[PDB]
Amino acid sequence: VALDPIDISXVLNXIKXDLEESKEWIRXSNXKLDXI
Amino acid sequence: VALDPIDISXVLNXIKXDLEESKEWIRXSNXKLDXI
Amino acid sequence: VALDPIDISXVLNXIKXDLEESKEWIRXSNXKLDXI
Amino acid sequence: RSDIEKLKEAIRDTNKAVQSVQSSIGNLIVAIKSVQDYVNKEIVPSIAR
Amino acid sequence: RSDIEKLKEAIRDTNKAVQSVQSSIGNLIVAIKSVQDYVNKEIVPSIAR
Amino acid sequence: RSDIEKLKEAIRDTNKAVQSVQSSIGNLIVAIKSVQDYVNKEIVPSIAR
């Protein structure tokens, strides 16, 4: 009767932040490799 | 009454694909390190 | 009536082991980079 | 010229390993989101009815 | 001096990418734990009542 | 000889960090699968009964 839905789409879109800003250092490293 | 089970074992075995084919580049890098 | 709670806090604290002992090789690499 | 080339290629392979890991995490997001929607849209309404 | 400097900086960027991945995994733990507590503390008691 | 050795060892440590991350993801799969089986085998039958 008092069952509200769970919403973690806050931390999930936190993970998706961490992942995109990993991908944009990876393209940083591969910048310095293409430098060599 | 119309509650079918959830089955994401599709994306999970997608993750387990990505992970095994990461592990098989890692063994690629450590190939070139053992090269040096 | 016979519904025991799920407890995976075993594998979760397994993940949190793997992650902390990744972080403590990362600080290992960045040791050898600060070496150069 | 040979050692620097090899080191550069080793870093390239490591980056490809990280990219595959990044793809794993992206799919992990989809899996967790799928569980959330199933609980909110199928389980919760079934209990309230 | 230029190639070794560049390689060192390339490894530094790769490590920063791994650190962001490590942060992703930490938040994944929080998300999964949040689903567990919701099932044990909200769903299971609602079915037993 | 000293700088190339050090760079090679730095890449080796980074790979070990990625390997630990790979182990984290493998356990994340087990955790998510555990939640799925619990919902399908314990929650869903409890609601249908």
The string of DSSP codes covering C1-36 is ---PPP--HHHHHHHHHHHHHHHHHHHHHHHHHHH-
Amino acid letter, D23: S
Q: Which residue has the tokens 């009964």?
A: F49
Write out the DSSP string of D14-28: HHHHHHHHHHHHHHH
Token couple for C28:
């290992």
Q: What is the resolution of this structure in A?
A: 2.0
Query: Which of F1, F6, F7 has the highest number of chain E CBs within 10 A, making it the mutation to test binding with E?
Result: F7
Instruction: List helix spans (H) across E1-49.
Output: 2-38, 44-48
Euclidean distance between the first and final Cα of chain D, in Å? 72
- C4 class by beta-carbon count within 10 Å (0-12 exposed, 13-18 middle, 19+ buried): exposed
Quick check: helix, strand or coil at residue E44? helix
Task: Count CA within 13 A, CB hemisphere, residue C3.
Answer: 22
Q: Are F2 and D5 in contact (CB under 8 A)?
A: no
Asked whether A22 and D18 are in contact (CB, 8 A), the reply is yes
Binding partners of B (≥3 Cβ pairs within 8 A) = D, F
For D22, the closest of E21, E31, E35 (CB atoms) is E21
E31 in contact with C at a CB cutoff of 8 Å?
no
CA F14 – CA F8 distance, rounded (Å):
10
Listed in sequence order, the residues at least 6 apart from A8 whose beta carbon sits closer than 8 Å to its beta carbon are: D32, D36, E31, E34, E35
The DSSP letter of residue E42 is: I
Q: How was this structure determined?
A: X-ray
Per CB-CB distance under 8 Å, the chain E contacts of D39 are 35, 38-39, 43
> What is the gyration radius of the CA atoms in chain B, in angstroms?
18
Considering only CB atoms, B3 lies closest to which of F15, F33, F47, namely F47
* Neighbors of chain D by Cβ distance (3+ pairs < 8 Å): A, B, E, F
Q: Using CB atoms within 10 A of its CB, is residue E11 exposed (0-12), middle (13-18) or buried (19+)?
A: buried
C19 to E22: CB separation less than 8 angstroms, yes or no: yes
User: Within a 10 A sphere around the Cβ of C3, how many other Cβ atoms?
Assistant: 16
